[PDB]
């Protein structure tokens, strides 16, 4: 239906098979419609993470340790204080932390309980690990007037270098850093143990693959190409296959959805893996 | 009309005769609809 | 459309030619509908 509340108009559009599902050519359905309503994100508003500082009201102090060492809790020999915090970019992602802060000295291992396997283990890097991700599709935006008044941005045509979106990782760099991480692990498990890395346990696509932001578009990458190694007792580059999705769920808040409008032109964001989220 | 905003569905339900009124089986109406919109 | 959500009725009304515009008796349109919604 168009603005003219009387007669419809046969139109067309492209949709990823991650967004739609077969009912029962064939009939398909927008996946969100079985769970909740979905809202189009405004084409003007962006999602670029911006550095935010936090401040306390008078009578309260922001304390900040400068101790390069920290187990996650305990006394700090070197404590300072600040007016407000440093700028932290709200980078929403999973597994791989992006555009965060760097650690000093050695790789940092922090966990609520290392002896307990149910808890997670935080790993903070010392050196930025470059990752370069690309979506080589110079596609158009056949916007359709689904008013009255309000407009919808559908997917036009896809032209250009029809390749699957993917990420480029410096392999030797990954190997080197991973090793530095294993050193730490050695230091909390023993000088005679074996360390193996593998992908997630599957299940939900959001926890399985790597979810991260990238200029309004949402990427889901198979990090099996990274987390596949091992260490004993004592270019080159990696290509990571990615998928695109227009309908996603943020913070795992069921009962709602959000439709991100496609972006015209080729996209090529850039970030640096600063930390990990191992279990 | 169910969630599928396209095809309707025939259902049934019970209502007290204090809630409904004859229009004009027979045709009946929710009494509130002549005065205002009822919010549940 | 009327309150009786089932059957419609034909009505009439007067409108200044400053308010309406020809589409394409003849067919006309409320001028505001090409720019935005309107509130009474």
């Amino acid at each position, epitope marked *: *239906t168009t603005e003219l*509340r*009387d*007669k*419809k108009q046969k139109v067309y559009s492209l949709f990823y098979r991650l967004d739609v599902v077969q009912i029962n050519n064939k009939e398909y359905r927008l996946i969100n419609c079985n769970t909740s309503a979905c809202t189009q994100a405004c084409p003007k508003v962006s999602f670029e993470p911006i550095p935010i500082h936090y401040c306390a009201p008078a009578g309260f102090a922001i304390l900040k340790c400068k101790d390069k060492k920290f187990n996650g809790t305990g006394p700090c020999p070197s404590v300072s204080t600040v007016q407000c915090t440093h700028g932290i970019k709200p980078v929403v992602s999973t597994q791989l932390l992006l555009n965060g802060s760097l650690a000093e000295e050695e790789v940092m291992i922090r966990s609520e309980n290392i002896t307990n396997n149910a808890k997670n283990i935080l790993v903070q890097f010392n050196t930025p690990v470059q990752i370069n991700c690309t979506r080589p599709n110079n596609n158009t935006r056949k916007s359709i007037r689904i008013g*009255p008044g309000q407009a919808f941005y559908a997917t036009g045509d896809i032209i250009g270098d029809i390749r699957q979106a993917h990420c480029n990782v410096s392999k030797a760099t990954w190997n080197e850093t991973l090793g530095k991480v294993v050193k730490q692990l050695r230091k909390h498990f023993g000088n005679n143990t074996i360390i193996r890395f593998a992908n997630s346990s599957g299940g939900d696509l959001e926890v399985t693959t790597h979810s991260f932001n990238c200029g309004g578009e949402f990427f889901y990458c198979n990090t099996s190409g990274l987390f596949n190694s091992t260490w004993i007792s004592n270019n080159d580059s990696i290509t990571l296959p990615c998928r695109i999705k227009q309908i996603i769920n943020m913070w795992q808040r069921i009962g709602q959805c959000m439709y991100a409008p496609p972006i015209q032109g080729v996209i090529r964001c850039v970030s640096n893996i600063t930390g990990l989220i191992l279990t | *009309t169910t969630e599928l*905003r*396209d095809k*309707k569905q025939k259902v049934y339900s019970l209502f007290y005769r204090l809630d409904v009124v004859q229009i004009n089986n027979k045709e009946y109406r929710l009494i509130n609809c002549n005065t205002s919109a009822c919010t549940q | *459309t009327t309150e009786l959500r089932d059957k*419609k009725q034909k009505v009439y009304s007067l409108f200044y030619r400053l308010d309406v515009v020809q589409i394409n008796n003849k067919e006309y349109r409320l001028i505001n509908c090409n720019t935005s919604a309107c509130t009474q």
Partner: antibody
Framework: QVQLVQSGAEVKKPGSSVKVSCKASGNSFSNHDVHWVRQATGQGLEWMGWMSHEGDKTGLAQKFQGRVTITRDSGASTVYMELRGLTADDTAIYYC?????????????????????????????????WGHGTAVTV | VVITQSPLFLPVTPGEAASLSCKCSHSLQHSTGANYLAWYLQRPGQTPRLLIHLATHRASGVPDRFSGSGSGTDFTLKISRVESDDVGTYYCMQGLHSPWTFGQGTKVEI
């Protein structure tokens, strides 16, 4: 190649009524519209009425308005046509037959506050299988 | 809603062409573009055979010497190379306006 079977020839007095019946092999009146057409000796075809195979539509010619009832048993196993107030003018062969329809949507106006307003309309497409007819002599 | 078929009676020399007219007081074109007119042949002793449906389509097994044309109010059935099997009465039938109606027929003979 559905086959239609019609009831036998009848002789009726002026002023009485006939009820003609028709069955279709494989219970085809469930899935194909029934028509009634009559023809007097040496004269043209005259369309009498029909029923949709959906069982949601019946219609008659102007001349049979108040004269004719077209009905069917449950499961559409048999179809019937009753003509009353017979005169010599009704002496004819009465045919049962099927046909297709194109239920096209004429009027329509989208609504942006719920379901839309539709107004379907059946339109005859073709006349497929003719029965052998029932001779009614008034 | 009236239908007039013309001519009423048509003698045709074997092998010659024949042209039948069916005209309606009202258009038989639906707003979707289809014309709901059909042609039927009835031979002596037989039930009618469908020749042409939706104005221009031959029915299944109808020889290609029968062809229909026309749109709106005026329709034509052409029979090339007429033979004794083509003898009988030709009826048009409008399917747009309820109640549906046959024309009064054109009688064709050799």
């Amino acid at each position: 190649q559905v086959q239609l079977v019609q009831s036998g020839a009848e002789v009726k007095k002026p002023g009485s009524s006939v009820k003609v019946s028709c069955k279709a092999s494989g219970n085809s009146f469930s899935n194909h519209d029934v028509h009634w057409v009559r023809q007097a000796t040496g004269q043209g075809l005259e369309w009498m009425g029909w029923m949709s195979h959906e069982g949601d539509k019946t219609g008659l010619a102007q001349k049979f308005q108040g004269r004719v009832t077209i009905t069917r048993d449950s499961g559409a196993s048999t179809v019937y046509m009753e003509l009353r107030g017979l005169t010599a003018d009704d002496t004819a062969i009465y045919y049962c037959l099927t046909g297709s329809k194109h239920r096209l949507r004429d009027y329509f106006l989208y609504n942006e506050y719920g379901p839309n307003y539709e107004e379907w309309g059946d339109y005859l497409a073709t006349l497929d299988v003719w029965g052998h007819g029932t001779a009614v002599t008034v | 809603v009236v239908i007039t078929q013309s001519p009423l009676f048509l003698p045709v020399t074997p092998g010659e062409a024949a042209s039948l007219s069916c005209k309606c007081s009202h258009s038989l074109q639906h707003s979707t573009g289809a014309n709901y007119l059909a042609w039927y042949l009835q031979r002596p002793g037989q039930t009618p055979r469908l020749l042409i449906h939706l104005a221009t389509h031959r029915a299944s097994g109808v020889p290609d010497r029968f062809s229909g044309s026309g749109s709106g109010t005026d329709f034509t059935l052409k029979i090339s190379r007429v033979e004794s099997d083509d003898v009988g009465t030709y009826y048009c039938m409008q399917g747009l306006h309820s109640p549906w109606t046959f024309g009064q027929g054109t009688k064709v003979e050799i």
